[PDB]
Amino acid sequence: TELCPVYAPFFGAIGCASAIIFTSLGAAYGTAKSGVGICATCVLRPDLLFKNIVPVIMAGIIAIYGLVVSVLVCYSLGQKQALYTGFIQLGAGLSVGLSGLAAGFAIGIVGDAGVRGSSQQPRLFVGMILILIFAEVLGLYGLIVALLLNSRATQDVVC
Amino acid sequence: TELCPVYAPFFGAIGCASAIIFTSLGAAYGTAKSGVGICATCVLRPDLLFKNIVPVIMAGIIAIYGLVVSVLVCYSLGQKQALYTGFIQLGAGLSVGLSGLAAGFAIGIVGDAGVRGSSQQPRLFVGMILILIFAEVLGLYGLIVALLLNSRATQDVVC
Amino acid sequence: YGIAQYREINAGLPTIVTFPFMFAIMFGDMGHGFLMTLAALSLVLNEKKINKMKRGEIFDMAFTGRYIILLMGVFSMYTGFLYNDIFSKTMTIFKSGWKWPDHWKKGESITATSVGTYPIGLDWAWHGTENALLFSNSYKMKLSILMGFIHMTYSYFFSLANHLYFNSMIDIIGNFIPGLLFMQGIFGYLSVCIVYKWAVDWVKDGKPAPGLLNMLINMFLSPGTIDDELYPHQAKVQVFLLLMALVCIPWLLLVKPLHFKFTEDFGDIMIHQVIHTIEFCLNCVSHTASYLRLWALSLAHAQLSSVLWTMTIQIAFGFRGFVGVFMTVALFAMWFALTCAVLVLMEGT
Amino acid sequence: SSFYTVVGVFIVVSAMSVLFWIMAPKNNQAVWRSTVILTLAMMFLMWAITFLCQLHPLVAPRRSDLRPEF
Amino acid sequence: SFSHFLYYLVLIVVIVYGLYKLFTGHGSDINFGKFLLRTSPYMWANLGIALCVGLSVVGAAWGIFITGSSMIGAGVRAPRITTKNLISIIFCEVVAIYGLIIAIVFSSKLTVATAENMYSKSNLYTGYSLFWAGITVGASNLICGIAVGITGATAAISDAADSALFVKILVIEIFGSILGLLGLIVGLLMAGKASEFQ
Amino acid sequence: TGKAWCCTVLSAFGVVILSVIAHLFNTNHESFVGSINDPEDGPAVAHTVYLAALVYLVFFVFCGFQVYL
Amino acid sequence: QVQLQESGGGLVEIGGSLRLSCAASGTLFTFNTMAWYRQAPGKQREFIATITSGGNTNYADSVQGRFTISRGNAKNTLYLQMNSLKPEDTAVYYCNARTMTGPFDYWGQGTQVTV
Amino acid sequence: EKEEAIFRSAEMALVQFYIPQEISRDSAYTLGQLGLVQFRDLNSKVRAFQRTFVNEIRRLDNVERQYRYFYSLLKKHDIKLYEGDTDKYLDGSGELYVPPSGSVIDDYVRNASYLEERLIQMEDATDQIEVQKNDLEQYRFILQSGD
Incomplete structure (x- = not known):
């Protein structure tokens, strides 16, 4: 019937909110x-x-x-x-949000252990940093997909 | 379908109450x-x-x-x-609201542990404040998103 | 990472240039590159003094790295220039290769026409362009794969330099040669394709531009079939290369154990070779895929830079008078603090 | 400009390198002979890829905000 | 527990509602087919792409903290552990790369259809295809991350006892990581034949 | 003493960066006034930005003396 | 806010050919429908032509085969071309851009043509 | 001439030392001053307490115990030891220098033992006074309390 119904903004608003x-x-x-x-x-x-x-x-x-x-x-x-x-911008919101959520949990759990261990085996600090950064990018992989989808959000759309 | 149905204020009231x-x-x-x-x-x-x-x-x-x-x-x-x-102003309500909830949990836990430990290690107090600031801004990010959305709620709107 | 075997190729020398350069290709920006270069210069020029005094735990790590920071700084400038980005603004050094229409109205959408090719780096006509991302991502992802393939190819040839020096011919015939054909037969072919596709004017010559993802997938999941032709006799070459890749598997798996069998210790040689075989083959795709990180880190770095300017400097130009001056002076300090603290220290790390 | 540009640059930068290979200083010889040769090679490739990418672009730039006076 | 009470309450009301509609002669009102046939295919496609990377990242993150915490604990009296055992983290992180890669491929399919063809045979097929293709890659990657992680933690604990053991246990992580490829392969197969939205 | 260095270098970057930006606005450079959304008046912006550069110049010489003594 | 502008108007010699150009700005989407209308003094507005986003064209009978309507390369740009003109063609001409549903229906300021 | 050992490892040679017992101690100091040779363990099979120089090791080990004790006494107070003189014997350059004579080492052993005997009695006699000082101070505080 129509491509642009009145409730379409709902997915944008909740996508925008759920991201943060x-x-x-x-x-x-x-x-x-x-x-x-x-x-x-x-x-x-x-x-x-x-x-x-x-x-x-x-x-x-x-x-x-x-x-x-x-x-x-x-x-x-x-x-x-x-x-x-x-x-398409709901997908951006979900992908970054669900990615950052997981990355935050991992950094918390492994950082907790690393800080304690580093206090009595000083060589262990570099081990902590290496692991933590491989956890950080798990947020970044969410960001990249969000950017890709958002780059397409208004391209060639008829309405 | 109408742009301005009679139930539209409902999501405003929920957003207004949810924020606080x-x-x-x-x-x-x-x-x-x-x-x-x-x-x-x-x-x-x-x-x-x-x-x-x-x-x-x-x-x-x-x-x-x-x-x-x-x-x-x-x-x-x-x-x-x-x-x-x-x-839009439902999204403004949720974004600040549930960001405040997240920041509240963070301040509660590190606030307790920092105060508990500081009483027998005076050098730790500056560390507690430094961590608490990172917890504090998690609420501030929610506010910035909420104010951006709110500013967009009524410009270039037809009814 | 480990102590090298007696008189095997030292990994140190290749690391001198490729480590800071593989950093720069991600951390590409003349602005942040300069700040990092200046920091290292202040540290290296004083090295006579800094070496003598007592140093803090973190500061000693920094001082130990002064030359490697300096070197990765200056490379960051060069690749930042090719990305044509300084603090998230472009540089209009040479004349652009794109020409806009001769007339248009306030807010009217427009499309450019080509005039030539830019001599150094990305053409500045792409800045602020509403479809810029579709070009940047096409460019950087292909750059990432090409750099990864070349880096792995170059590194792999040190394996030959060890086998020859220790006069171990069975390693040449059993390990190096089959591994080379398997690695280049697939991902060398893919590299040649993407660099070949740039050389053909598909629009002028009136043939559809083929999809590189499709032909790579179909080469395995539907061999001998093509959607769009990239070059003559393509079907013959693809099936041959597929068969070449396959025959190398049993060749790699068997020949060295069998050689030892002809001279129950042979059981350990058998177990080692199959473990090596399965690891090598799946690592070949897994490692090649992992190089996409070079593009991901760059795109994230670019967007944070753009947003930070849009949020903390572009505001200042909206004000006038002594309030405008105060707003400008305050906002710059905020912009410089965030730029240095996050976009150099954290992103750089 | 056309593809003959990159092969043209490849020849001169390669020729420049092999000249340095034999001309290199004798002190710390292996460090010089490695870093200079390999930095030229790796530094050349990014230019070649970035230039080659723009010979025959399949998509043109578009924008909507540009003052007609520009 | 209270949550189980909710489950049984929801089960009971669904049964009663179904029985009610059936006896009054309106059994055709609850028409699952027409819902599936009339919702916008952009929902299925975008929801599939989002959950694909989303679940893959959850898997990798869960795998990493399983391995990392044990690796750090084992390293206290054996710091040699920290540099050689990194490979277990690598096998966890690559599971996220596969999720990203599929997102690259699927994103190309999201053209915009004209209104006359919105709910046509081809567009609906692409909508369902991308949805389930996303789920298998996401779910398989989530499972894979856990299995590799649990094995990685086991390897680090064992390596600290005797260096000779690590090489033997490492074999099990290879078998675990293969589940990542199989998820990717099936994802590409079931999506490969779909056409971009016309 | 170290207290003065940070204010010195931050101001030093302030002087050069603000003045370069001011010059581009005063020049009506395309990358700064080309967009429909950019400010409407080059030299008007250039003036206020140029004054902001002077403010940082005062802080630079002030701290340069305090670190020199 | 959305807005439109005509251009290309003015007086022309009898039987001469002419082109009118139009553009619309300030919206992110492509308009489903765009059209031209005319109004001579002493009369209501008269339809002339319209073109869809898919390039389908429709015309008034009076200008069939005399006028041609087309869209430009970039989004939301429109053209009209008339191969010959006569006194009964003299009027002010308007652009119109529409949405498939709702009140979003925009109109331009208009431009004059005379023989 | 020396080889540029950066592309591959330096070439290594294995060398045996036969040293008469008379010159042994003096020679081994020179090899330490050289800072250049890495020794093998020729008899890893014999148990730790069975190796031939165990008694010598114990002797200096007891001195180091006493030096840790003295350093504790310093750190217990605000007293601080004389820093520096790091370069008196070697610039790290490997120049030959003569080691302490055996009688000097004996004197360190004798001196360290003598100092422990003195400081043990002196320290213990001190804190007995401190306890009484602390006890009376507490007692006085009660009497100074208000009615």
């Missing part, structure tokens, strides 16, 4: 798990405190991926738009 | 966990209570983010409005 919501939950969990690890170990080894905050900033990075996708998606919203544009 | 509800649950949990930690440790060390109280203040700020978005949405409610405005 799920990513924020992931970053919060990553900060919480590693934060207790830092507080736990620094009681006896305060000198390495600032070396051990890395899991926290890496968790912080994930939240920024959620923000930029949400901003890039938001600028596409409009009253009259096709279902095509509606769903 | 979820944000209050986040701030409540952050206050509770921090409060137990403060009361548990300051029995032996009363001299530092007014230094250790910061996590409660930090959690308290999150409620303010929900308030301003809720008020800004509230003054855009009307009897006759486009369904597009309803979805």
Whole structure:
């Protein structure tokens, strides 16, 4: 019947919102798990405190991926738009959100262990950083798919 | 189909209420966990209570983010409005609301552990503040998305 | 990573250039490249002084890396120039190869026509272009695969340099030769195809531009069949190369164990070879795929840069008077802080 | 310009390299002979790929926001 | 538990509603076919692409923290572990690459159809095809990440005891990682014949 | 002492970057005033940006002295 | 906000050929339908031609085979060309762009032609 | 002439040493000053406490115990030891220098033993006073409390 029904913006609005919501939950969990690890170990080894905050900033990075996708998606919203544009930016929201959520959980769990181990086997720090970064990109792979879908959102659309 | 059906304000009211509800649950949990930690440790060390109280203040700020978005949405409610405005300010409500909930959990846990540990390692206090700032901005990201969406709720809308 | 075997090829020398260059190809931006270069220069020029004093745990790691940071800095400039990007703005050095229409109205959509080819790097006509991503992603993904294939090919030939030096001919005939044919027969062919497709003017010559994903997949899942022709006799070559890849499998699997059998320790040689065979074959596709990371990291780095400017500098130009001055002065400090803290330290790491 | 550009550059940069191979200094010889030769090779390829990508583009740039005065 | 009570409540109401419609002679009202035949195919396609990378990333992340936490714990008295056992993380991370790759391929199919052909035979086929093709790749990658991760943690614990054991256990991770390829191969097959939205 | 260095170098970049941007606006360079969405007046923007450069120049010489002494 | 502009108008010699050009800006999607209308003094608006996004064309009988309507290369650009003109063709001419459903129906300011 | 051992490893040679027992200790100091040779373990089969120089090892090991004890006494107080003189024997250059004579090593052993005997009694006698000082201070605080 029609390509541009009145409810089409709903998928855009929820896609835009879910991008930051799920990513924020992931970053919060990553900060919480590693934060207790830092507080736990620094009681006896305060000198390495600032070396051990890395899991926290890496968790912080994930939240920024959620923000930029949400901003890039938001600028596409409009009253009259096709279902095509509606769903394609829902896909962008889900893919980054569900990716950042997983990356946040992993950084929290492995950062917790790494911070404790690093306090008494100093060679172990480089091992931690190598593992954490391979967890970080799992958020980035979500961002890339979101960017690809969003690049197509308004191309050649008739309405 | 009409652009401005009679149920359109519903998603506005849900968005308006949701902004403050979820944000209050986040701030409540952050206050509770921090409060137990403060009361548990300051029995032996009363001299530092007014230094250790910061996590409660930090959690308290999150409620303010929900308030301003809720008020800004509230003054855009009307009897006759486009369904597009309803979805947009529903998204504004959820994004800040559930980001505040996420930030609330983060502040509560690291706030408790940091206060618990700081009482017997004075160098750790600066570490607690540094981590709490990363937790704090997770709420701020939600606010920025909410204000962007809200600004887009009523421009270039026909009814 | 490990201590090298006595007088095998030292991995150090190839690492000197390829490590910072494989970093630069991701971290491509003249702006962030300069800031990193300047940081290393301040560190290396003082090395006489810094070497003598006591150093912190993290600072000692940085000082130990001063030359490798410097080298990866200057490469970041060069590849940033080819990407034609400085702080997320393009540089209009040479005349563009694209020409826009001669008239249009305020807000009217337009399409360009080609005039030539840019001499160095991406043509600046692509900036702000509403279909830019479809060109950048086409370009960078193919660049990623080509760099990965060449890097693996070059590295693999050091295996030959070891076998010859230790006078081990069975390793040549059993391992190196079958591995070479299997690796180049598939992914060398793919590399030749994508670099060949750029040389043909499909629009002028009136033939449809073929799909590279399709022909790669169909070469295995529907051999001997073609959707769109890339060159003469394509079907004959594809089936031959498929058969060449297949025969190398049992050749790689058997010959070395059998040679030892002709001179129950032979059981261990058999087990080792099959483990080596299965690992090598699946690693061949897995490793080649992994090089897409070079494109992914670059695209993410570009977008963060663009958004940061759009959110924290482009605002300032909307204001006037002494409030405008104050807004400008404040926003720059925010922009520079985020640029240095995130887009250099974190992204660079 | 056409494909004969890249093979033209390939010849000169290759010729430049083999000249340095034999002319290289004797102190730290292996380091010089490796890094100079291999940096030219790897540095050349990115230009060649980036130039070659733009000989016969299949899609032209489009935009909607451009002041007619430009 | 309360959640089980919800499940049985939902089961009962569905049964009652079905029986009710059946006896009153309106059994054809609950027409699953017409729902499946009338919803927009863009929903199926985009939902498939999203869940494909989404579930693949969940699998890789779950695999990594299974392996990483044990590897770090084992490394405390045997730091030699940290540099050689990295390969187990590699086998987990590549599972995300396959998810990304399929997203590249499928994204090319998302052209925009004209209204006259929106619900035609070909467009519907592509919609269902991309949806299920996405799910198998995503679900297979999710399962693969767990299995490789559990084996990777086991390898690190064993390597710390005797270096000779790692090479023997490593074989099991290879068998585990093959499930990634098979998921990818079936994904490409069932999607390969679909045409872009006309 | 270290306290002065960061304010020095941040200002030093401020002087050069702001002034270069100001020049491009004053020149009506296409990459800065070409879009329909760009500001409408080159030299008007150039003036205020140019003043912002002067502000950072004051901070540069101020801190340059404090780190020199 | 969306807006449109005509161009190419003005007076012309009897029997001469002429072209009118039109564009629309400020919307992300391609318009389903675009059309031309005319109005002589003392009369209501008269239909002339319309063209779909798929390139289908329809014309008024009075200008059948005399006028031709086509879309440009870029989105939301439109052209009209008349191979000969006569006094009964003199009028102001308007562009129109439409959406398949709803109130989104835009009209241009118009331009004059005379013999 | 020396080979450029960066493309492949340097070529290594295995060399046997026969040293008379008289010159043994003096010679081994030179090889340490050379900083150039990596030794093999010729008798890994014999148990640790059965190797021939175990008694010598024990002797210096007991001195190091005492030096750790003295360093603890310093660190217990604010006292700080004299830093530096890192280069007095070697610039790391491998120049030949003469080792301490056996009588000097004997003196270190004798001196270290003598110092432990003194400081043990001195430290223990000290903290007995500190306890009494601490005890009386607490007692006084009660009497100074208000009615």
